Amino acid sequence: EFAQHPLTPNGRKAGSAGDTALAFWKDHLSWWHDWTPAPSSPKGAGLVPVSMLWGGGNNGQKDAQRLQQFEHLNSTPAYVMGFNEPDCSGADVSADIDVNTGVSLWNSLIAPMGQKGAALGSPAMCRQKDESWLKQFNQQQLTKSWDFTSIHIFKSDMTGVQADIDYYWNTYQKPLWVTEFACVFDQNNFTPCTDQNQINQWISDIVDLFEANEHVLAYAYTDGLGLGSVWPPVNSDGSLSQSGQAYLNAISKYHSR
């Protein structure tokens, strides 16, 4: 009888999306991802490295490299996530694949990893609570469904964060992982927050909300590009930024054993 993976990695919700701030945050995290099949920054050594199949290998240089690396994995990860934003476009930005193409990749490459014991994460939607892609994908013939629903939260207040959580719990009825989050005026041409005071409070508030919410089992601060000059967790001189320090101070509140 095989032991199942806990859907919170190694007793802590907190993780990182990317590795620029990983050395500074490590001691208060359990896990990280880097959008690749095999997260390998040496800054993460000891944390749970969560695998991803980003896309279908026809929407960018890195997309094609990552599909080939996923096909060549000699091993089964403890946790694997599906596609990054198949409902958005842009070469090496979002996966840009239809539901039919998603089903074929999921059944050929992701479901067999789950048969060998990996915990499976859904594809993550750029449309947030307005998605239709995952609703259609979930109605298709999948050889194995997902264990945790992956979500991206790009919102300017905690009302928007809560509306994303409620939509994905009510609709899919599985535990959630927030696999990327950042403070963004999403309805106003995707304008990233730029007020340091507001960002520091938003970070503090969102970590508290996630830690208290029974349906959120993991979360991860993103360092991806396109989020303005204030959100990045590392300054141009290499030092931890004020935004990076707000995350460090929030996740350390929940690390007391």
UniProtKB/TrEMBL annotation:
Pfam families: Glyco_hydro_cc
Cysteine disulfide partners in this protein: 88-126, 183-193
Cellular-component GO terms for this entry: fungal-type cell wall
Example of a GO biological process term: fungal-type cell wall polysaccharide metabolic process
InterPro entries cross-referenced by the UniProt entry: ASL1, Asl1_glyco_hydro_catalytic, GH
Domain Asl1-like glycosyl hydrolase catalytic: 22-247
Highest rank taxon of the organism: Eukaryota
PANTHER family membership: ALKALI-SENSITIVE LINKAGE PROTEIN 1, ASL1-LIKE GLYCOSYL HYDROLASE CATALYTIC DOMAIN-CONTAINING PROTEIN
Protein name: Asl1-like glycosyl hydrolase catalytic domain-containing protein
